[PDB]
Design a binder for these strands. Structure first.
Lengths: 51, 117, 177, 76, 136
RNA sequence: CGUCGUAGUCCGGAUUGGAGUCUGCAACUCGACUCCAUGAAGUCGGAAUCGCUAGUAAUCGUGGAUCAGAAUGCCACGGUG
RNA sequence: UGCCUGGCGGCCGUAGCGCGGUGGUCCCACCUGACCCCAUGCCGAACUCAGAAGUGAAACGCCGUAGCGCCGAUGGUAGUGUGGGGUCUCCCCAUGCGAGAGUAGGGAACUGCCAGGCAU
RNA sequence: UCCUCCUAAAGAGUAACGGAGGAGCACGAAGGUUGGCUAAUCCUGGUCGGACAUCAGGAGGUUAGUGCAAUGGCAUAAGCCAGCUUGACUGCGAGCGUGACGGCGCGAGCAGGUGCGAAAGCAGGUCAUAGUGAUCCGGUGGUUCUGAAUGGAAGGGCCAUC
RNA sequence: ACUUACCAACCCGAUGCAAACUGCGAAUACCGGAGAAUGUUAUCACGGGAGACACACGGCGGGUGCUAACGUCCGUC
RNA sequence: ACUAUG
RNA sequence: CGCGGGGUGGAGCAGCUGGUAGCUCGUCGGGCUCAUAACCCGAAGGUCGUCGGUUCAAAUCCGGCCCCCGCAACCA
């Protein structure tokens, strides 16, 4: 359905991402989450991007 | 629903949890005039130590039986009886009473005297 | 202050001898006084409901809880959780200082006033009345009404029957027929 | 629309019965709701699958106000 | 013609018809028509038999009907190479076990009521008897 | 000469309530006029359509016949124009 | 040792719901007040704190009552495992198990640990 | 193809062009945690307000709710409302269940590092059961691997993902 | 405002029916443990070699059909 | 821009 | 029966993507004419076949019942 895929990308400049879904119409504003980067081995901010 | 039954309803989840853990629990029972406290065994029937603002050793000292400065005296008393009988680890059962003011002040006076929670 | 000190002295003793209660606790007490403004056309615009609130803010003297729609229902055209009214609940000091300024000034000042209807009790001892307009109260500065807007009162009481309700309110000098 | 359709059978039910001795981890009952609840040494999973947390013999019983069937355990 | 107003399900399994009846006593009236064998009353049968006994008393009396046709029954139409689903519901039946009371009468005498239930019995497919009420 | 200020108003007077006056054997059905109160419609009228060439149209009052009483009609009279 | 109350339990309607009676020295409840801790999508209603003038009315607890719930045999009936038989859509015989409903009847719970109060 | 009920004979499983219905998604909150709360419906009174809307009280006891079928659950709520947040974490996993196999499901507990809570604790998505697609080929990012004389690179691998 | 021989929700009493109703509930079967006797190890695991995957009727429990069929589709012997 | 009938 | 489509003011039609019913003719009232027709002006009128569901809400989504069309009903 109208429920597209997205990378969340780490703010430490490892190119580690999580991938997840988002409704683009009902929420336009960009998704920002703390999550565990396993390369540096810390919790870190992760921001939206294109899959 | 009167206040006593609603307070038990609040308490019940805490206590069912503390059964399956198998924990010794410091039950407290606040009243407008008084405040009570028991340490109850892992099985959940038999009591090990008690203190309260009725039992006369503690009542003699105090100004008034049902306020913060009473509760600090009772929380002091239960620790000093429990440490005699080899009881360090307990889990503080607030029994449907907000952790705050008088019940808070009981618990923080039991942490002072070194009863671990 | 005034009506509450009046209750403790004059009314308690007088309703003991009338009904023969045994303990002093059984005498009816005035629990609360609930206001209301069942707007219904804030579906039009929410500034009606602000003017509704700020009226009740003036009349009572404390901030009103705006109420949401419990259900949806079609004849009104309402979503569930549309703001469809406001209220205040008055107790303690702010009850009695309102309950004075009802009896004293703003019951006289109703137009075409032939008392208040004594069969408007609900069956276990609480009174309810409309007022057609808010201008009967002092603080509603007339020259500043955008619109005349009615209002309900509801005096809630610790009373068994409507008989003991009509005892208690009549014993404050509450103007009935 | 007409008929023709059913799902695949999900092989629920009790697996280990009372008396039967288990190893911690062993599932005891798969189930949709909580026909049975967890007592002593027993986990409710997330699909309400009930499993041993210790080795021992399974015990069923009834308990509490509502007469609910608890699976518990007697660690040997 | 008797037939429930609405049900849950249009169609029902065939089932069996074993065992003896509940509803053995004559409760409502003085007399009654107890079944002795075992089958199905259709709804047309139950009606045909009411119209016999009603005619026969000249409307004195009161009549109770104790059985209701609430099982539906399907038939396939003519030529239907089997399968292709279950048939349409043609008609309705009650199942009857040995001992069910079917009709009850009072407000007539035992002369007339014997003759009314004889005239009903000829419309029904199952063997029947006359019974009077027992005090316990 | 004063006053009202563009408002359904100190515009408009319909309608209804109350109390009267007069004529008349008699004002219920159904008279006119007065007083107090009430204060509708109506903000210049669609298609269409009428009258008038000078003391005319427009507008303002006055009188008469009929008639106990009952004229916004009818017949007549002058004013302004 | 007895009587009364509070807390934590075991037990899960023989234990509950109603109806009637009763308890305040302590206990408990309502109760008095609120600048402070804290609180209300408004409100000291609740939660909370500071208290102790009043009251057992409500609530709670205790006692009584078979009005409603609740439990409930014996016997018989239904069903059915194995073997056999029929008039074989359904039954019967030998044998083993044996309900549900109902009936008599029972029943106004029983029981533990700790604290406090009155009597002895 | 998948999910739910019945058929199915009180463990599991069990056919038919047998009887009934659903899915091919949604949600950064509708997830996590701490604290609090308890429904439908009907009756009585009350400005405009009517059978139906906000207010008060009483009866009632989940007849309600649970994002969506059905079933089983649910008051310690799994239902409803607030505060703070990202455990809708990474590495693993004793041991179970379920499949012919490919596979699918449950999982205490260990390590790293988070969130809520005073603490005991709880959290590896949602009350559970549908919401899906093997391999090949190719694409995008990363990498202590490889690199056809040697140094690079191209391509290949491994990890993430389309 | 008044009378009603008309339909009559809920509650009350008596009375039946249900595969997809259950405040009840067997017999059997199934899982587990202990104990004799008995059975040519009949259980399980690992290798070599298959065949077979059109079944039929009879009894019992059911679906479907008309409780039609030497009918059809499951279960168990 | 007009128009048909009795 | 197998498949599909359609029932809307009096007539023929549009609206069917849930929250809003339009178009041409006819009817009614007023004008023009000696009168009628044409022509000009003004006003109304639709249980959306029927029963029942779903939703807060149904012309509209979903089911049964009734009528009306169209296509198919073959190989022996």
């Amino acid at each position: 359905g109208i429920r597209e895929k997205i990378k969340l990308v780490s703010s430490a400049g490892t190119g580690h991402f999580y991938t997840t879904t988002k409704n683009k119409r009902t929420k336009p504003e960009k998704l920002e989450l703390k999550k565990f980067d396993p390369v540096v081995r810390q919790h870190v901010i992760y921001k939206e991007a294109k899959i | 629903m009167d206040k006593k039954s609603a307070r038990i309803r609040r308490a019940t989840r805490a206590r069912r949890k503390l059964q399956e853990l198998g924990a010794t629990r410091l039950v407290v029972h606040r009243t407008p005039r008084h405040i009570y406290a028991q340490v109850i065994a892992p099985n959940g029937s038999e009591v090990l130590v008690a203190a309260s603002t009725v039992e006369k050793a503690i009542a003699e000292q105090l100004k008034y039986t049902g306020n913060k400065d009473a509760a600090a005296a009772v929380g002091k008393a239960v620790a000093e009886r429990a440490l005699e009988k080899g009881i360090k680890d307990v889990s503080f059962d607030r029994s449907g009473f907000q952790y705050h003011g008088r019940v808070q002040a009981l618990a923080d006076a039991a942490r002072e005297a070194g009863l671990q929670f | 202050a005034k009506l509450h000190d009046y209750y403790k002295d004059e009314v308690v003793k007088k309703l003991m001898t009338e009904f023969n209660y045994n303990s002093v606790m059984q005498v009816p007490r005035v629990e609360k006084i609930t206001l209301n403004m069942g707007v219904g056309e804030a579906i039009a615009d929410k500034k009606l409901l602000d003017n509704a609130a700020a009226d009740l803010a003036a009349i009572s003297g404390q901030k009103p809880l705006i109420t949401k729609a419990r259900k949806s229902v079609a004849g009104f055209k309402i979503r569930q959780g549309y703001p469809i009214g406001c209220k205040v609940t008055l107790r303690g000091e702010r009850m009695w200082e309102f309950f004075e300024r009802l009896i004293t000034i703003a019951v006289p000042r109703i137009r075409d006033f032939r008392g208040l209807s004594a069969k408007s009790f609900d069956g276990r001892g609480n009174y309810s009345m409309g007022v057609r307009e808010q201008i009967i109260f002092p603080e509603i500065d007339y020259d500043k009404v955008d619109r005349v807007r009615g209002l309900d009162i509801t005096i809630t009481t610790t009373a068994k029957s409507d008989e003991e309700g009509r005892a208690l309110l009549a014993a404050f000098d509450f103007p009935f027929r | 629309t007409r008929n023709g359709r059913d799902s695949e059978a999900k092989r629920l039910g009790v697996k280990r019965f009372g008396g039967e001795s288990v190893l911690a981890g062993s599932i005891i009952v798969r189930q949709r709701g909580t026909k049975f609840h967890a007592g002593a040494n027993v986990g409710c999973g997330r699909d309400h699958t009930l499993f041993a947390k210790a080795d021992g013999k399974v015990k069923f019983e009834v308990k509490g106000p509502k007469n609910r069937k608890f699976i518990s355990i007697e660690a040997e | 013609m008797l037939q429930p107003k609405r049900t849950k399900f249009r169609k029902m399994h065939k089932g069996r018809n074993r065992g003896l009846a509940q509803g053995t006593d004559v409760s409502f009236g003085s007399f009654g028509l107890k079944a002795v064998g075992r089958g199905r009353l259709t709804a047309r049968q139950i009606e045909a038999a009411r119209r016999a006994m009603t005619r026969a008393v000249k409307r004195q009396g009161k009549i109770w009907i104790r059985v209701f046709p609430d099982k539906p029954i399907t038939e396939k139409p003519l030529a239907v190479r089997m399968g292709k689903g279950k048939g349409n519901v043609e008609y309705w039946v009650a199942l009857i076990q040995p001992g069910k009371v079917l009709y009850e009468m009072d407000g007539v005498p035992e002369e007339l009521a014997r003759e009314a239930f004889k005239l009903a019995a000829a419309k029904l497919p199952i063997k029947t008897t006359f019974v009077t009420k027992t005090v316990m």
